[PDB]
Design a protein around this ligand. Structure first.
Ligand SMILES: *[C@@H]1O[C@H](CO)[C@@H](O[C@@H]2O[C@H](CO)[C@@H](O[C@@H]3O[C@H](CO[C@H]4O[C@H](CO)[C@@H](O)[C@H](O[C@H]5O[C@H](CO)[C@@H](O)[C@H](O)[C@@H]5O[C@H]5O[C@H](CO)[C@@H](O)[C@H](O)[C@@H]5O)[C@@H]4O)[C@@H](O)[C@H](O[C@H]4O[C@H](CO)[C@@H](O)[C@H](O)[C@@H]4O[C@H]4O[C@H](CO)[C@@H](O)[C@H](O)[C@@H]4O)[C@@H]3O)[C@H](O)[C@H]2NC(C)=O)[C@H](O)[C@H]1NC(C)=O
Ligand SMILES: CC(C)(C)c1cc(Cl)c(C#N)cc1OCc1n[nH]c2ncccc12
Ligand SMILES: [Ca+2]
Ligand SMILES: [Ca+2]
Ligand SMILES: [Cl-]
Ligand code: NA
Ligand code: NA
Ligand SMILES: [Zn+2]
Length: 807
């Protein structure tokens, strides 16, 4: 209940929320059906429109007008935004030449440059270029300020997940807004676009920027605007708040436009009808900047122009129906569209089986436009699993397509309405969105590389002098956007120092069940192999320092001619293995006599070694090697590759992937990149939280042993960004690509896996591309500790994702 017979007189767009049943005069009142009776009359005035004209100049103040052209309007803070242009001979902001803002130029009583976030729904990255002729205000922001060619959204590429990521720095799995629609089984409650449950605070995890600000003494404007408040009134309200007294005035503000998303759904991303919404958004930007200029704030305020996601061409005819695959289609609930989420219609049905649903949806039609996954098997770059609101079964839908339960869902919701949609995999080009920063704290005329929207919360906090709440950004990775206010991070401290074992065991102390045909015998070459086991080639194979171990554990550094490793006594395998392959390196085969060779490592105790008998007796599990025997520098060096300390457990199906990567792709990348340094290793993430498992979280071991089975294998492949220099003699910036491959007992994910590895393996590896940072979270390791580069630059490198999309 609301007692709507109080009044909004002098309270219009009040910042503090008053509690029921007292009637409200803030934005949200409309969305809650709780505004006072006179809210429209007093707070939503429209009389005479939004622009001054010559005949209104110097008018007598009429309080009914939407905005004012009277002499007193500047001091009242309520002129139409074009007032000084029409009445005082001033230029529009867009007509002024760009001049570098070297320092904030703020009115007295301004303690810090304010931040205004201008968010645009569905603003696809390529609009900046393709629409530039109709968006002069936006183009001036972009060209004069700091811009990226695009910004990567989070998955799913929907509105609420991305806007709340912008506000928190968190992945959807952590903040809780995992889609525009959700069921929470602990609450037994549903979240929808329509209606009232979406306002309950239990949906919204983390700490959004407005709360971070408020807790630290910085006042915030509203972030959520009711759909019926027109854009001109949103801008006027921001400008009015900016004229408040110092003690009352917010420092952070947000504007939101429902466009161009609204029209893009109807007409497609480049429909001819899209030109007008882009014109209109630009006009609104022009109003803001003109308004700021009137207040003498245009060289004081930092402005962020940012989108939530892009838009793709999607029509009703490109719909896959689960009714064409499953017999049991009425025993499931599907969350449909540009992603699929499946759960049981009834939790009383004990004949519901996820395995049989997945199998009925796997590779059933030759041009099938979706792929089913258990959520823990989704590419780790998506970070889309660790939330009870994300259903166990997930469908990744091909760009340009939808998935639905039955045809009737599409025509009874029989002809097609829509031509655009979004929600797809966040690496897809059409889903990419925009970032522009303009103001005293941003750089002048500066282009920066594409980056992820999870990074922006930290920067917004830096722009406002706030300490960010714990989040998924990597604070410092965006310092290159900023003139000043940089955050100066330090490297994390190493927690565990390594042991450096020498030769401590005789061959006969081992009873591992391993064989090797290696009884094959010189003081020239005897001292030389000794130097290699003490680390004489380490400078070649460990280019960026050894990774630091950031948790408590017991591990050994092991040196060899061709590779170096950090060997875990707890997990009985390397945490990491590092090696460099020059452009000139040669690929050889595993000699016939060494096919089943595994050799005891006399530096490492039997008790902390793997054994071959375990693999013999585990009928499902085989083994691979981290440093590949195929890339040995010489016949004699190859024996090192067969050490028991270089062995890792591998399903035969996965060994097909791994063998092709090692035998073919590494050498290909070395030829293309002019050498590469490779770091490879295992990952254990049995609870799919994106974070390194402790020993007691491991769910699977090689049968009859304490050898833990990795969930994933990673590689980090580094070279010189200037590819005219070899990877091992690089003077400047680095270039990286990485992956986190799921360690699966089948290749069901790859529908073409019966074919030669040259037709499917690289495609798999591209799907599972990763950031170095993702591998850091999953391993508790810290890479690139010893380079010549600035730490901020290295942080940027660690956040890079190699996407494999063209332009
Ligand atoms: C991305 O960045 C984020 C933020 O940095 C990272 O998330 C953090 O990860 C930490 C480790 O997983 C985690 O720390 C835990 O916090 C517990 C207290 O949690 C509450 O308080 C915080 C602080 O205000 C709050 O933010 C939390 O909010 C979550 O939950 C509510 C709903 O309940 C949601 O509104 C919200 O969206 C959020 O949900 C997300 O996180 C939770 C986990 O907290 C997930 O379950 C959800 O699916 C969702 O992803 C909480 O309200 C604390 O109690 C934990 O302590 C246990 O573990 C320690 C280890 O040191 C152990 O010593 C203790 O014994 C203790 O164990 C006891 O509980 C166990 C489980 O009940 C039990 O088995 C034991 O036997 C013990 O009884 C733990 O420290 C931190 O909360 C989150 N923060 C957020 C915001 O998500 C994320 O990791 C980053 N991602 C990547 C990939 O890097
Ligand atoms: C989390 C939240 C959605 C409040 C949000 C976050 C940020 Cl960071 C911004 C910014 N800039 C805007 C935000 O909301 C804008 C908004 N208003 N009205 C809407 N209606 C439908 C959909 C979105 C909106
Ligand atoms: Ca949106
Ligand atoms: Ca884990
Ligand atoms: Cl109302
Ligand atoms: Na086996
Ligand atoms: Na297959
Ligand atoms: Zn949309």
């Amino acid at each position: 209940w609301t007692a709507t017979s109080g009044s909004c007189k002098g309270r219009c767009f009040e910042l503090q929320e008053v509690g029921p049943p007292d009637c409200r005069c803030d934005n949200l009142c409309k969305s809650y059906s709780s505004c006072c009776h006179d809210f429209d009359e007093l707070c939503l005035k429209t009389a005479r429109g939004w622009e001054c004209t010559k005949d209104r100049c110097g008018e007598v103040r009429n309080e009914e007008n939407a905005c004012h052209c009277s002499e007193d309007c500047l001091s009242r803070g309520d002129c139409c935004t074009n007032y000084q242009v029409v009445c005082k001979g001033e230029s529009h902001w867009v007509d002024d030449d760009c001049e570098e803002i070297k320092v904030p130029e703020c009115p007295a009583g301004f303690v810090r440059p304010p931040l205004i976030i201008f968010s645009v729904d569905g603003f696809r990255a390529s609009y900046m270029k393709k629409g530039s002729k109709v968006m002069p205000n936006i183009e001036k922001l972009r060209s004069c300020g700091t811009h990226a060619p695009y910004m990567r959204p989070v998955y799913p590429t929907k509105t609420f997940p991305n806007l709340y990521t912008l506000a928190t720095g968190l992945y959807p799995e952590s903040h809780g807004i995992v889609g525009n629609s959700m069921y929470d089984p602990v609450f037994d409650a549903s979240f929808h676009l329509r209606g009232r449950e979406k306002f309950n605070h239990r949906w919204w995890g983390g700490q959004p920027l407005w709360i971070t600000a408020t807790k630290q003494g910085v006042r915030a404007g509203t972030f959520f605007w009711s759909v019926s408040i027109p854009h001109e009134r949103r801008i006027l309200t921001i400008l009015q708040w900016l004229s408040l007294p110092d003690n009352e005035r917010p420092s952070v503000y947000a504007f939101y436009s429902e466009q161009p998303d609204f029209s893009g759904h109807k007409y497609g991303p480049f429909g001819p009808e899209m030109t007008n919404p882009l014109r209109e958004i630009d006009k609104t930007v022009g109003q803001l900047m003109d308004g700021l200029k009137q207040l003498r704030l245009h060289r004081c305020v930092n402005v962020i122009f940012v989108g939530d996601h892009g838009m793709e061409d999607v029509t009703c005819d490109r719909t896959e129906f689960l009714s064409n695959y499953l017999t049991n289609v009425d025993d499931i609930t599907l969350v449909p569209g540009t992603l699929g989420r499946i759960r049981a219609k009834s939790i009383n049905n004990s004949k519901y089986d996820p395995k049989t649903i997945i199998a009925a949806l796997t590779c059933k039609k030759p041009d099938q436009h979706f792929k089913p996954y258990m959520k823990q098997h989704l590419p780790k770059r998506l970070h889309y699993a660790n939330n009870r609101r994300i259903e166990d079964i997930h469908l990744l839908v091909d760009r340009r397509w939808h998935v639905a339960r039955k045809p009737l869902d599409v025509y009874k919701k029989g002809k097609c309405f829509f031509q655009g949609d979004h929600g797809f995999d966040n690496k897809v080009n059409s889903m990419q969105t925009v970032f522009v920063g303009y103001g005293p704290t941003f750089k002048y005329r500066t282009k920066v590389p594409p980056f992820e929207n999870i990074e922006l919360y930290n920067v917004m906090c830096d722009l406002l002098g706030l300490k960010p709440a714990p989040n998924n950004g990597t604070h410092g990775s965006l310092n290159h956007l900023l003139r000043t206010n940089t955050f100066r991070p330090t490297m994390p401290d190493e927690v565990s120092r390594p042991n450096y074992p020498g030769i401590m065991y005789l061959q006969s102390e081992f009873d591992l069940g391993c064989t090797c045909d290696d009884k094959v015998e010189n003081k020239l070459e005897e001292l030389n192999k000794r130097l290699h086991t003490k680390g004489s080639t380490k400078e070649r194979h460990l280019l960026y320092g050894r990774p630091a171990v950031l948790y408590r554990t017991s591990y050994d550094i092991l040196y060899h001619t061709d590779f170096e490793s950090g060997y875990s006594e707890i997990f009985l395998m390397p945490l990491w293995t590092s090696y460099t392959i020059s452009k000139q390196a040669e690929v050889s085969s595993i000699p016939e006599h060494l096919t089943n060779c595994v050799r005891p490592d006399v530096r490492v105790s039997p008790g902390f070694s793997q054994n071959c008998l375990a693999y013999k007796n585990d009928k499902q599990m085989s083994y691979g090697f981290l440093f590949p025997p195929y890339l040995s520098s010489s016949p004699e060096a190859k024996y090192d590759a067969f050490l028991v300390t270089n062995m890792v457990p591998m399903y035969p199906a996965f060994k097909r992937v791994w063998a092709y990567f090692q035998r073919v792709l590494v050498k290909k990348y070395a030829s293309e990149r002019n050498g590469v340094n490779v770091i490879s290793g295992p990952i254990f993430d049995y609870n799919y939280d994106g974070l390194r498992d402790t020993e007691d979280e491991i769910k699977q071991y090689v049968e009859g042993s304490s050898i833990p089975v990795p969930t994933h294998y990673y590689s980090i492949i580094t070279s010189c960004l200037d590819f005219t220099q070899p990877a091992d003699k690089c003077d400047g910036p680095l270039s990286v690509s990485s992956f986190i491959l799921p360690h699966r007992p089948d290749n069901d994910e790859s529908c073409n896996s019966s074919e030669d590895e040259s037709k499917w393996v690289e495609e798999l590896m591209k799907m599972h591309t990763a950031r170095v940072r993702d591998i850091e979270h999953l391993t508790g390791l810290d890479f690139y500790r010893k380079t010549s580069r600035s730490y901020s630059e290295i942080l940027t490198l660690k956040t890079y994702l190699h996407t494999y999309e063209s332009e």
